[PDB]
Structures are given as C-alpha cells and as structure tokens.
Amino acid sequence: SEVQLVESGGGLVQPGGSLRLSSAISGFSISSTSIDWVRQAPGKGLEWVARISPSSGSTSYADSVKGRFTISADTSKNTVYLQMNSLRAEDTAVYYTGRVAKALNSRSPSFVVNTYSSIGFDYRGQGTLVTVS
Amino acid sequence: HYIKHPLQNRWALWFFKNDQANLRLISKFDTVEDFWALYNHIQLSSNLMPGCDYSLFKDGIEPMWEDEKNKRGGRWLITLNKQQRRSDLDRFWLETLLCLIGESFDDYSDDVCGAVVNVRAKGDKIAIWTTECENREAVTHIGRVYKERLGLPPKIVIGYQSHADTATKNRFVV
C-alpha cells in the first residue's frame, strides 16, 4: 500500500544513559518479513544493529551491541522498538528501520549492509538522531 | 510522505532480440525503491528465450559499440557454461546491477558505461562496459573490484576486450 517507516525516540543522553527508539510502519505487516535497525555514525558507512522476524519472534544483534541493545515489536500497532542501555560515543548515530530487498533476504543482514549499504533496502525511513554526551 | 533514496546516476534497462527497432527501453530509474520495483516485475535472465539480452546503461548512453562513450571502450567478460544457468546466472547479474547502481568502483565509477547479460544456447555471458580501453589504471581496478564482488577464486582468470577488437584477444587479464 502507501508504505511508511517513521523512526522516533532519539535525543541527547549522558554516557551510560538509556533510550527506547520506536518505528511506526504503514503499508505492509511487520509479521510478513524481517525489520532491521541500522545506524550511520558521523561521516562513516551504514552499520547493521539488530534484526526481528515478528512472525517467529526470532532476533539477532551485531557483536558491537550484544548485551546492551534489545529489539522488540508490538504486532497490534505494527511498530518495532530498540531498547538501548550503557550508551557511549560508539553508539552516536542516526538510527533507521529498513526492509532488506526480497532478492537479498537469503544473505545475512551484516553482509547486505557491509556490501550493498543503502541499496540493499527496498524500503528505509529518514531515521532518528541519537547523540551521547 | 515516504522519501525515496536517490542513486548517483539515472540508469536505463534495455531488452534486445536478434533480427534500433530490435532494441527496446524497459524502464529508467534514479532511486533505490524504483530499481527494486522494476527488478521484482521483470522476468529473470535464466527464464529469457535464447538470443536475448538485458543491459543496464547510464541515462543518455545507448548499449551499442558505436555510441560515443562506448566507441573507444571495452568490456570485462564473464563466460558461463550450460550447467551455471540455474546456479549462478541470475545471482551474478543482480550482483552486476547492484555494483553499477551502487557506484562500487571508487575513483573509476565514471569509466563504467553499463553492463550486458547475453542469453545464448551454447553458453551465457555477463559483461561490464567501460569507456576507455587504454586506461590501464581505471580498467584494472574495475576488473579486480568486479571479480571480488562475484566471489571468483584467484585461479579463475577474466579478460578485458576492446570493442574495436571484438568487431572482426584481451587488452588486460585479472
């Protein structure tokens, strides 16, 4: 339908602080596919954060965020969340939700994002900013 | 409301059948979304009728030798046997499409004119066309980058042919 991915919850935090990001998705059900959080650090490439397949509730995290970040979903509201704790300079970036293109969903999200970057996503939002200082 | 992600260049997807009137524009696109929209609604290369070509070329470049941005150019050729039609053809073509629209050749992306997939009875071919076949630096870099992205062993050797040589032997190998 009229597809939409709207990220929010981003802002300014002190080192060690915590935030919850939201993404309200329209035009396709989040249980039809896997949704990816990805971030862009200042003047550096697109970095995969976490994946969620709400159909099964299966998830996976980048080694950089394991233990600190949690991906979740409210299937009734068609919204995905990212709970972030113990934030630091490493985590300062704009955060996007994106759907990896059909033809590429056989390959891992770490590969799709490192190799194809922005062009791996058939849909991706304009993102929300997270600054740590 | 939804904001599309623009590509660095406007691209045109062509279809060719053997005997200007033989060559047809499928669609043009200049965003990541409009590309995937096209790719998901056109037949795979593996399912095309023998003696037919798909080609992706930058906007304003005809996918023909005699085009002025192709005249002094050449191509990196990938040669596929009959068995590889099912396993590698469709995969190697999408990797070529993504390479081009992704501007994946650093300083030498402006040398890339487009890419061609040939669907033939004897054996299928994929080629990236560049603009100057005497530019050792630009051609050699585009070759190494391409060969890696396809995931071919170092022992597998690919050649670069001038279009002037083909219109009758490689200028480079990598």
Author numbering:
A (entry chain B): 1 to 133
B (entry chain A): 33 to 51, 57 to 205, 212 to 217
Give me lines lifted from the publication on this model.
Here we show that an autonomous and disufhide-free VH domain is suitable for intracellular studies and use it to construct a high-diversity phage display library. Using this library and affinity maturation techniques we identify VH domains with picomolar affinity against eIF4E, a protein commonly hyper-activated in cancer.
The structure also showed that the S108R mutation does not interact directly with the surface of eIF4E, but that it engages a structured water network that forms an h-bond to the backbone carbonyl of R128 on eIF4E. In addition, S108R formed a cation-π interaction with the sidechain of the neighbouring F112, further stabilising the local fold of the CDR3 loop. The eIF4E: VH-1C5D104A/S108R/F120I (VH-S4) structure also revealed that the substitution D104A, removes the unfavourable packing of the negatively charged D104 side chain against Y76. However, many of these molecules are poorly active and have not been clinically approved and the alternative interaction pose formed by VH-S4 with eIF4E represents a distinct and unexplored avenue for therapeutic development strategies.
